[PDB]
Design a protein around this ligand. Sequence first.
Ligand SMILES: *O[P@@]1(=O)OC[C@H]2O[C@@H](n3cnc4c(N)ncnc43)[C@H](O)[C@@H]2OP(=O)(O)OC[C@H]2O[C@@H](n3ccc(=O)[nH]c3=O)[C@H](O1)[C@@H]2O
Lengths: 181, 182
Amino acid sequence: SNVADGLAWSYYFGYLRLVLPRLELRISESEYFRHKITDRKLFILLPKTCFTCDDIEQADSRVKWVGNLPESKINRGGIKERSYKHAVHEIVMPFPDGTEEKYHFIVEYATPLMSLYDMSRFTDAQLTGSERDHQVVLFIRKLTEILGKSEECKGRYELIPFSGDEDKNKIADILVALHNN
Amino acid sequence: SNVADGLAWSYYFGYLRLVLPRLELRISESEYFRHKITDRKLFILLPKTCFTCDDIEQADSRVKWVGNLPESKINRGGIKERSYKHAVHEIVMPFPDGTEEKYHFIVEYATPLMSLYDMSRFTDAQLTGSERDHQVVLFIRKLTEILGKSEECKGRYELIPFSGDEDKNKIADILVALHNNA
Ligand SMILES: *O[P@@]1(=O)OC[C@H]2O[C@@H](n3cnc4c(N)ncnc43)[C@H](O)[C@@H]2OP(=O)(O)OC[C@H]2O[C@@H](n3ccc(=O)[nH]c3=O)[C@H](O1)[C@@H]2O
């Protein structure tokens, strides 16, 4: 088929199908985060221009990494237990009267996109610049279709497509907009 | 391109190119396995027919899981540090006079092959039984030539294709055969 089809299905079968159903239970186990995270869903970032996947907290004074959730073991694999954990980001929306509104979100990048970037940049590449950009669009569209039909992931994810370079400061405003309604 | 081509490059950039340069260093840090492991390389299992990987020690009395190496923390496209840990297996070859020769290998399955099986398994599958089998062969071919041209991985890996259904008892014989070569 396509290069993106494998990456989107690998992203789902090897990760999203495993951690999204466990997401509400991980937050309940964390006595420090159980009351801080109101939106118990994984906000997946889908960068379209840049693929370095830089830390979002470095591009916004309102975004601050405040630690990780307790790790959990996923039995999916071959005679090897893998461990996953989620990082929690604190979003503090300021107001002109000095008051604040504090939020907490589970935000992660779509790591398979970083693999699409690694294929094209090195010499003797599998894909050129134009051939990779098409796979990036197909990846975003395919990952949406997979999660839209997955019944065990319904209501436990959000897809945020954006140009992952100069507008990382837009993440904080998008997360709060999805939280309010 | 192909489904297998993407999974092969993903497995290379997302895992092999990360843990194979760290494998030599990670073994020497384990005070328990630094001298017990004389094959400082990763043995990648490539099942062709059966993909229910199950466990390798349950199909062979000469194979036994005996712990892990110290884990490696790597930032992989995120603020967090993902855990990359290898499992050490004990392989004791019996002899008719009561003596034994005990080896220790680092062997694990190629994870993308599990995703290919998962694609064709569930309903509304993109891959059929025939299309999956073709992509499994292309994946093995592609992963071989990628690792053959990699300077960061030269001498740090071995590829072991096998059926996977009942050939799980053959893995212990192949590992000792590859060790006796070197
Ligand atoms: O283990 P895989 O099945 O993961 C596939 C794919 O899902 C995402 N993923 C999985 N676990 C994750 C955690 N704990 N945090 C964040 N993201 C996670 C990854 O995007 C992963 O793709 P990749 O770019 O990370 O790696 C490529 C390729 O290598 C395999 N792999 C990775 C780590 C490992 O310890 N063992 C292993 O075999 C991946 O399979 C993937 O096929």
